[PDB]
């Protein structure tokens, strides 16, 4: 099933090779794939471990404006976010997480809420 809109959460972690290593959180990102995935991966582990939550994590590590809702960008409609986002998001099950997604901004991890 794939409706016209769904709720999902994501964690943005730009890198040094990002199209624009700068966001509302910082203006000089020099974190490479190592430091990049190192953050996302670490976040994934804690969550799957039951120690931390993507919501709490994302916020404290959300380089994007998503940090406001701790990553949760509410319910959106197809054609709003990057293609890879919608697909992975709309392809994940209830309470699922998408692996490291490399996009213009950097590496993003999404999850299906609705």
From Swiss-Prot:
GO terms for cellular component: ciliary basal body; cytoplasm; cytosol; glutamatergic synapse; midbody; nuclear speck; nucleoplasm; nucleus. Expressed in immune cells in the lung (at protein level). The phosphorylated form at Ser-22 is expressed in normal breast tissue cells but not in breast cancer cells. It catalyses: [protein]-peptidylproline (omega=180) = [protein]-peptidylproline (omega=0). Keywords: Acetylation, Cell cycle, Cytoplasm, Isomerase, Nucleus, Phosphoprotein, Rotamase. The keyword Cell wall biogenesis/degradation does not apply. The modification Phosphoserine is found at residues 22, 59. Its EC number is 5.2.1.8. Its main location: nucleus. Residues 3-114 form the PpiC domain. Phosphorylation at Ser-22 by DAPK1 results in inhibition of its catalytic activity, nuclear localization, and its ability to induce centrosome amplification, chromosome instability and cell transformation. Ser-22 is dephosphorylated upon IL33-stimulation of dendritic cells. Interacts with STIL. Interacts with KIF20B. Interacts with NEK6. Interacts (via WW domain) with PRKX. Interacts with BTK. Interacts (via PpiC domain) with DAPK1. Interacts with the phosphorylated form of RAF1. Interacts (via WW domain) with ATCAY; upon NGF stimulation. Interacts with PML (isoform PML-4). Interacts with BCL6. Interacts with FBXW7, disrupting FBXW7 dimerization and promoting FBXW7 autoubiquitination and degradation. Directly interacts with RBBP8/CtIP; this interaction depends upon RBBP8 phosphorylation. This is Peptidyl-prolyl cis-trans isomerase NIMA-interacting 1. It comes from Homo sapiens (Human).
